Amino acid sequence: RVRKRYLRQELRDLGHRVQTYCEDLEGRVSEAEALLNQQ
Amino acid sequence: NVLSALEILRLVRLDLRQLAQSVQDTIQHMRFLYLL
Amino acid sequence: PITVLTQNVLSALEILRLVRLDLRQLAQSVQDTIQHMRFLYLL
Amino acid sequence: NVPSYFGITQNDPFIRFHTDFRGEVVNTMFENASTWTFSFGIWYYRLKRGLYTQPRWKRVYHLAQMDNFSISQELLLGVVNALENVTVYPTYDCVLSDLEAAACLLAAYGHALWEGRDPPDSVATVLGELPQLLPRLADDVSREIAAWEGGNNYYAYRDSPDLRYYMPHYHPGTFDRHVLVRLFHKRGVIQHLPGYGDDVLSLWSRRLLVGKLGRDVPVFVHEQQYLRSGLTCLAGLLLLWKVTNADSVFAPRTGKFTLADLLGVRNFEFLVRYYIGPWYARDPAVTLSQLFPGLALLAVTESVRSGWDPSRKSNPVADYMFAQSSKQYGDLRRLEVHDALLFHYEHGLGRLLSVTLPRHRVSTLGSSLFNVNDIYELLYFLVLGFLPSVAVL
Amino acid sequence: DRQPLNPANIEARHHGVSDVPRLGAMDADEPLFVDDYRATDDEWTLQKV
Amino acid sequence: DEVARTDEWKGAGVSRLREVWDVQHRVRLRVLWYVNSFWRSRELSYDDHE
Amino acid sequence: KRDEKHRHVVNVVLELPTEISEATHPVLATMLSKYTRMSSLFNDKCAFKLDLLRMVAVSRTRR
């Protein structure tokens, strides 16, 4: 029970971190597109 | 030219969305399957 | 005396190089966390 | 006053080199003298042929031609780095080295023999006395092998099949059926091992390591991974002493490979003079794989040939090399392959020393896998980990 | 099941999209699936009445 | 004149409030962190090797 | 090969009649990608059958 609870928390934390990184990369790509298209 | 770069970056945005959604769905699936 | 178009292209290329590095960073972090969990909890 | 010269054999004086002797000799060999005709073993050739097909990796390995009998420097340095990294784990710093653990283990047994001699308070004396103390241990091991009943590996650790990590104590029974620990607790060296079906060792370790480790001298019996490391080191040391003393290097040369082609008393004593004392002096972190890479290579090859699997075509050295060379492998995954390679190496050495005549076994394996023909070539391969040979066939 | 439900143990239903892992968990007890609506005090009182 | 430790302790105040459960997740308690604790000034190292 | 996985999950998990197939049902074709990645729960065919039913239902709704 203890190990399942800890692993579940770790998995959810990583699922949040991957979303944060994905949004950061998406924002960088969008800014690059905006700068290249219309300054 | 810039149009090819713009199309490639749009594809990059789409693939980022797909990867994020797939990873969240996968972790949720294994959480409901085994962790319960 | 080059135009600002080339400068914008170069700055964009620098940003995309940074993105390229960050992708490898993400992969490394994911692998490290995966093996951490596998060692500790999954056993 | 650290010497920069070493002598593999008594044939030539102590060859002088500056620093980082493996890389130094590698680049000197590959620069000053032609290598396109030089060759390693046939096993190296089949590994080269298997590894050439991969397009990304062949660029690093520089395997331009499959039909070529020569090997580039990159693949050799990668293999030597893999076999050196097998014994040292950078993730956790080792408070005690395998040489120190083995030295303590043998000095505990010889305390009665050390009692007649003057009492030493440093490892610098046991390192000198080891070539005299260890033959008694070898004779005792042979006697216990003949006496105790029950791939005939007498040195195999009976670890649980599920575990694949070297670090822990261990599962009970892992040290069971291993003959040397039988001798050690029969002679009182290890009074009791938890999980078995101040000791003299503790006092000796404290005396010979209070300077290096300070007051804190961990007890070996409880922190028993040090037992595993020192036991493997001691087995390798005694086997290597037997190999070195078996035949003198003054025997007539039968293979074309010679130190000139490379550069363009007791047999073990020359190795003891520099490889044991000065190497400790410059860096106490030296392990067995640093002094004897060839032993590690032959043990790994023996384990691969025997078909043994620690979990129960795959080259564990190749897997480890792919591990450090690629960022896809995680820290714990690279440690897993590290411990798998360690398991293979220790199983191979245990299979080797369980043979009545290891001389024939090592000679045949060197002849069929690494072009090793006589004692001179065997010693050079053991010191360097590789044996270049001019290809004339 | 045994302990009070934390917000982590409460999951939101997703209607109109594929939700097969939830359908697999139908017989489970530890996660509770809710309809994303919350009952106001007035309708709570009327329901009790 | 000098300033008492109690005055700076009061004025500095807290900035943390966190819930911590026991290992078996039976009991939950809250931890307060004071920005004026001598805990800050120490050169502390922390690591959680697996 | 995705063909073998699709055929397995269509003929064993979903137990669908031969009259209905991937070519004839766009909703099934869209759903196949999601179902294939979930190799477990295949002993619980009812979940997949019910999910297919509700996807068809949401397909037919006026929104």
Smallest CA-to-CA distance from D144 within D91, D195, D180, D95 is with D180
- Window F:31-50, CB contacts with C under 8 Å: 50
Whether residue C27 and residue D332 make contact (CB cut-off 8 A), yes or no, is no
Q: Is C40 on the interface with F (CB under 8 A)?
A: yes
Which tokens sit at D133? 């103390």
Rounded distance between C-alpha atoms, residue C38 and residue D336, angstroms:
12
For D339-356, b/e burial (b = at least 16 CB within 10 A) is bbbbbbbbbbbbbbbbbe
Whether residue B36 and residue E31 make contact (CB cut-off 8 A), yes or no, is yes
End-to-end distance of chain F based on CA atoms, in angstroms?
Answer: 52
Q: Do chains F and A touch (3 or more CB pairs under 8 A)?
A: yes
**Which residues of E fall within a CB distance of 8 Å from G48?**
20
Tokens 């060197």 sit at which residue? D366
Method: cryo-EM
Q: Render G5-54 in DSSP notation, one character per residue.
A: HHHHIIIIIS---TTS-TTT-HHHHHHHHHHHT--S-TT-HHHHHHHHHH
Which amino acid is residue D331, in one-letter code? D
Q: At E49, is the secondary structure helix, strand, or coil?
A: coil
Which amino acid is residue E16, in one-letter code? G
Q: Alpha-carbon torsion G9, G14, G15, G21, what sign?
A: negative
**Nearest by CB to A36, which of C12, C19, C40?**
C12
Q: How far is B20 from chain A (nearest CA, A)?
A: 6
Whether residue D332 and residue C39 make contact (CB cut-off 8 A), yes or no, is yes
Torsion, CA D198, CA D202, CA D203, CA D207, rounded to 10: -150
- Percentage helix, strand, coil, to 5, in chain B? 85, 0, 15
Strand partners, D16: D5
Q: How far is F21 from chain A (nearest CA, A)?
A: 12
Nearest CA in chain A to F26: A2
Q: Alpha-carbon torsion D221, D227, D231, D233, what sign?
A: negative
Rounded distance between C-alpha atoms, residue D299 and residue D178, angstroms:
18
Whether residue B32 and residue E22 make contact (CB cut-off 8 A), yes or no, is yes
Residue D265 burial (CB < 10 Å; 0-12/13-18/19+)?
exposed
DSSP F21: E
**Which residues of B fall within a CB distance of 8 Å from G37?**
22, 26
What are the angstrom distances between the C-alpha of D98 and each of D235, D286, F9?
A: 11, 8, 53
- Window C:17-36, CB contacts with F under 8 Å: 36
Q: Is F19 on the interface with C (CB under 8 A)?
A: no
Rounded distance between C-alpha atoms, residue D244 and residue D7, angstroms:
13
**Which residues of B fall within a CB distance of 8 Å from A33?**
6, 9-10
Entry resolution in angstroms?
A: 3.0
Tokens 């203890």 sit at which residue? A2
DSSP E40: -
End-to-end distance of chain G based on CA atoms, in angstroms?
Answer: 36
Instruction: Report phi then psi at F32, rounded to 5.
Output: -100, 140
Interstrand relation of D15-16 and D5-6 (parallel, antiparallel or unpaired): antiparallel
Q: Which of B21, B27, B36 to mutate to test the interface with E (most CBs of E within 10 A)?
A: B36
The separation between CA G11 and the C-alpha centre of its own chain, rounded to angstroms, equals: 9
Rounded distance between C-alpha atoms, residue D271 and residue D6, angstroms:
8
What are the angstrom distances between the C-alpha of D35 and each of A19, D8, D160, E27?
A: 53, 22, 46, 71
**Which residues of G fall within a CB distance of 8 Å from B33?**
40-41
Q: Is C38 on the interface with D (CB under 8 A)?
A: yes
Rounded distance between C-alpha atoms, residue D352 and residue D337, angstroms:
22
What are the angstrom distances between the C-alpha of D139 and each of D120, D147, D203, D232, G59?
A: 25, 12, 25, 18, 84
Smallest CA-to-CA distance from C31 within D326, D77, D312 is with D326
Smallest CA-to-CA distance from D106 within D200, D12, D193, D177 is with D200
Torsion, CA C13, CA C15, CA C18, CA C24, rounded to 10: -80
What are the angstrom distances between the C-alpha of D8 and each of D242, D258, D260, D267, D366?
A: 16, 12, 14, 9, 18
Q: Is C12 on the interface with A (CB under 8 A)?
A: yes
Which tokens sit at G55? 């996807």
Rounded distance between C-alpha atoms, residue F50 and residue E34, angstroms:
37
Nearest CA in chain F to C37: F50
CB pairs under 8 A between A and C: 42
Rounded distance between C-alpha atoms, residue D230 and residue D345, angstroms:
14
Residues G59, G29: contact at Cβ < 8 Å?
Answer: no
- Could you give the maximum distance between any two Cα atoms of chain B, in Å? 53
- Residues from B contacting E (CB-CB < 8 Å) are 28-29, 32-33, 36
**Nearest by CB to B2, which of A7, A19, A37?**
A37
Residue D393 burial (CB < 10 Å; 0-12/13-18/19+)?
exposed
DSSP C40: I
